[PDB]
Amino acid sequence: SADDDNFLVPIAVGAALAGVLILVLLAYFIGLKHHHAGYEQF
Amino acid sequence: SADDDNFLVPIAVGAALAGVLILVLLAYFIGLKHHHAGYEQF
Amino acid sequence: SADDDNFLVPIAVGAALAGVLILVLLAYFIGLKHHHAGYEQF
- Determine the Cα–Cα distance for residues C41 and B30; give it in Å rounded to an integer: 22
Q: Of C4, C20, C29, which to mutate for an interface test with A (greatest number of A Cβ within 10 Å)?
A: C20
Per the structure, the count of domains in chain B is 1
Distance from CA of residue A24 to its chain's centroid?
3
Distance from CA of residue A5 to its chain's centroid?
23
CB atoms < 10 A from the CB of B38, how many?
Answer: 5
- Of A33, A24, A38, C4, the closest CA to residue B3 belongs to C4
Q: Of C21, C22, C25, which to mutate for an interface test with B (greatest number of B Cβ within 10 Å)?
A: C21
- Determine the Cα–Cα distance for residues B40 and A27; give it in Å rounded to an integer: 24
- The answer for residues whose C-beta is within 8 angstroms of residue A31's C-beta and 6 or more apart is C27, C30
Q: Which of A23, A24, A30 sits opposite B31 (nearest CB)?
A: A30
Q: Per DSSP, which regions of chain A are E strands? A: none
Cα torsion for A20, B15, A3, B24, to the nearest 10°?
-30
Q: Which of C4, C20, C25 sits opposite B1 (nearest CB)?
A: C4
Residues of B whose CB is below 8 A from C24: 20, 23-24, 27
C-alpha pair distances (Å), C10 with each of B16, B19, B30, C15: 20, 24, 36, 10
List the alpha helices (DSSP H) in C1-42. 12-32
Q: Which amino acid is residue A32, in one-letter code?
A: L
Q: Which domain holds residue B22?
A: 1-42
- Of A9, A2, C2, A8, the closest CA to residue B1 belongs to C2
Q: Which chains touch C (3 or more CB pairs under 8 A)?
A: A, B
Technique used to solve these coordinates: NMR
Distance from CA of residue A11 to its chain's centroid?
18
- Give backbone dihedrals phi and psi of B4, rounded to 5 degrees, phi first: -60, -35
> What does R_g of chain B's alpha carbons equal in angstroms?
19
